Structure formats: C-alpha cells, structure tokens
Amino acid sequence: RNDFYCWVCHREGQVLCCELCPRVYHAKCLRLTSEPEGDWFCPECEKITVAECIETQSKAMTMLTIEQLSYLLKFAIQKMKQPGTDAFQKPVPLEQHPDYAEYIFHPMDLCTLEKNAKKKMYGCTEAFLADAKWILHNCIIYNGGNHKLTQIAKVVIKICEHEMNEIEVCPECYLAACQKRDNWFCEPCSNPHPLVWAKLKGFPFWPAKALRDKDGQVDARFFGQHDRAWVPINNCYLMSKEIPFSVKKTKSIFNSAMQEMEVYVENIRRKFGVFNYSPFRTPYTPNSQYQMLLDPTNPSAGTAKIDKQEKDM
C-alpha cells in the first residue's frame, strides 16, 4: 500500500506515487523540470537502478558480490546500533502505540534491517540506506519532527550514510578497518592506493594513502593516527625518499607513521613485486600509476601483467 506522507518533507498532501516502491512525493519537493507521465520511478529507485547496473556500478560494487556486501552491511548495522538507539532496535510494538499502523504503512527497525541484509536482500549500499531511511521518516511522521526520538533517528541515518560512503570509497579498506587486525592499515588493497606526501594548511607534510580524487581534492588517509582529510591535489606529491620538511612538535609520532608506511611499502612489494619512489616534489595526479610501473623510467610499459586472474572474514 502506498505511503501517504511525502518521503522528502514527511507531510501529507497531493503526492506522486512511485511505480516501483511505496514512496510518495509532493511534486514541489522534487524541484522538477515538469511532472511525470505514466512511467515514473522515484529518486530512490532511480539511484538504486543506476547503482545495481553491472556496467555503471561503483568500483566498490564491481569489487563486491551480494554476499560480500551483506557481510559489510553487518558491520555497518553494528555501528548504527549504538548505545541509546534502543527505540529503533526492534519493531514498534502495537501494545504501546495502538494507532501506529494508521500512520506508518512501512515499518522499519534495525533488527529488520539486519535480518534483511543477512537474507541478501540488498544489492547495493544505496538500497540499504534507502531502506534504513524508513526509520527516520516513520519517526518524524508519528512522533513529530521536533520530538527527541527524531534526533536519535537522524543520528542513526547519519551513521548509516557515513558507513555506506566508506564501503563505496573502498570495501577492502572498510573491512580492514572493521576487523582491526594488526597493522590493518598497512595491508595493501587489490588496486593499491598511491602513497603521497600530503600537506593540509596548518599541518606538517605527512605520509598518506590517496583513496580517491574528486574535484581537485584528494581523500588522504594518514599513516600513524589514521586520521583523514580532503587535501588539495596541488599539496600532494608522490612518495619520495627525500622528505618535504615541516617544523613539527610531534617527532615520535612522525617516526611511528613513517615506520608504518615502510611496512606498507614492504607489503606492496611483497604482493605486487614493485614500488617506485618518485623524484622529490613530483606532483600526484589522479589515478596515478607511477608507483606500480614495472620500469618507472618507461611509463609506456605500464604495470606488469602479473595477474593470474585469481579471485577475509
């Protein structure tokens, strides 16, 4: 049965109906070039469609099976199920809220989410977040937007959003971070992240993994403390023997980070057989291949075809 409350603003009124799911939307809340005809898939269903399409799925998703994703979603639910999320951990009981089903046509809770994930019902992170969002929508409808429960539901979704985003950035990093085995941060990924010197305004030059590029910013994960930041691409250099010098007050901390990095370099060398340090102050460029070149003096020869076409919880 279709919902009566707009998925965007959580209010009733004249609402559009999705063909593919029970969500409904005020035309106005969608900021359209014009209202639809006849075939309309909502923005949630559009997103999920674009994502679960083999040829336009994300690096993360192309890497992942449904089953592998379900294992990762299990970790994400554990993050969502923090202390103080009591109200949303099990289905709302009718004994306490006898009129709940007059307002809420599509109940959801964290336990249901977990069971659904285990049953391999989610084909992508997008589908998981969209389903989790019923918790927040429902809470706002029934309790009110300013109710204290809504604060808690908002945090649950913000946690979900963060976790989904992290899976999408790199599922292998995510799994590593979840299990926290020793030197998890030194374990190379199947498509290894470039090592850079990264300088954030206000901070000393520091070793990091470059996880992605977006609009001239690099998603840098720093050795040592395992902090993170977007770093301007022009402030990122490929890793070199010579260190770009910064005054600092944290000498043992820097040493620890450099130690960690050298383990990582040893691991990359072990797993892929190469690692190329670059000349001092070599700009990092998007999707940099340099560190993996067979012969760094011959970029046209590229990386070594060493894959055997082969394919940890």
Amino acid at 307: D
Instruction: Please state, in angstroms and rounded to a whole number, the distance separating the CA atoms of residues 199 and 218.
Output: 11
Which residue's CB comes closest to Zn ion? 6
Cβ-based nearer residue to Zn ion, 161 or 172: 172
Edge-to-edge order in the sheet of strand 206-214: 228-232, 217-222, 206-214, 195-198, 236-238
Q: What is the DSSP letter of 283?
A: B
The annotation status of 97 as a binding-site residue, yes or no, is no
Q: What is the three-class DSSP state of 37?
A: coil
* Residues 200 and 192 sit within 8 Å (Cβ to Cβ): no
Cβ-based nearer residue to Zn ion, 20 or 66: 20
Q: Is 30 in the site for Zn ion (CB under 5 A)?
A: no
Q: Segment near Zn ion (CB under 5 A), from 8-16, 56-64, 76-84, 223-231?
A: 8-16
| Most distant CA atoms of the chain, gap in Å | 73
Nearest alpha carbon to residue 239 among 301, 298, 292:
292
Find the radius of gyration of the CA atoms of the chain.
23
> Could you tell me which residues are beta bridge partners of residue 16?
25
Of the candidate residues 21, 141, 196, 238, the single one contacting Zn ion (CB under 5 A): 21
Of the candidate residues 4, 9, 40, 143, the single one contacting Zn ion (CB under 5 A): 9
Phi-psi region of 193 (alpha: psi -120 to 50; beta: other; left: phi over 0): beta
The annotation status of 18 as a binding-site residue, yes or no, is yes
Of the candidate residues 4, 26, 97, 106, the single one contacting Zn ion (CB under 5 A): 26
The gap between the terminal CA atoms of the chain, to the nearest Å, is: 39
Q: Is 213 in the site for Zn ion (CB under 5 A)?
A: no
Instruction: Please state, in angstroms and rounded to a whole number, the distance separating the CA atoms of residues 139 and 275.
Output: 52
Q: Is 189 in the site for Zn ion (CB under 5 A)?
A: yes
Of the candidate residues 48, 170, 200, 218, the single one contacting Zn ion (CB under 5 A): 170
Q: Between 43 and 82, how does the x/- string for binding to Zn ion read (CB under 5 A)?
A: --x-------------------------------------
The annotation status of 6 as a binding-site residue, yes or no, is yes
Q: Is 8 in the site for Zn ion (CB under 5 A)?
A: yes
Of the candidate residues 3, 6, 127, 175, the single one contacting Zn ion (CB under 5 A): 6
The annotation status of 111 as a binding-site residue, yes or no, is no
Name the burial class of residue 172, with classes exposed (0-12), middle (13-18) and buried (19+) by CB atoms within 10 angstroms of its CB.
Answer: middle
* Residues 61 and 51 sit within 8 Å (Cβ to Cβ): yes
Q: H or E stretch including 267?
A: helix 251-272
Q: Segment near Zn ion (CB under 5 A), from 37-45, 147-155, 252-260, 304-312?
A: 37-45
Q: What is the DSSP letter of 86?
A: G
Instruction: Please state, in angstroms and rounded to a whole number, the distance separating the CA atoms of residues 244 and 258.
Output: 13
Cβ-based nearer residue to Zn ion, 254 or 257: 257
Least spacing, CB of residue 6 vs Zn ion, in Å: 3
Cβ-based nearer residue to Zn ion, 6 or 153: 6
Q: Is 42 in the site for Zn ion (CB under 5 A)?
A: yes
260, two tokens:
């960690």
Least spacing, CB of residue 285 vs Zn ion, in Å: 19
The annotation status of 189 as a binding-site residue, yes or no, is yes
Q: Is 12 in the site for Zn ion (CB under 5 A)?
A: no
Binding site for Zn ion (CB under 5 A): 6, 8-9, 18, 20-21, 23, 26, 29, 42, 45, 170, 172-173, 189
Known binding positions: 6, 9, 18, 21, 26, 29, 42, 45, 170, 173, 189
Known binding positions for Zn(2+): 6, 9, 18, 21, 26, 29, 42, 45, 170, 173, 189
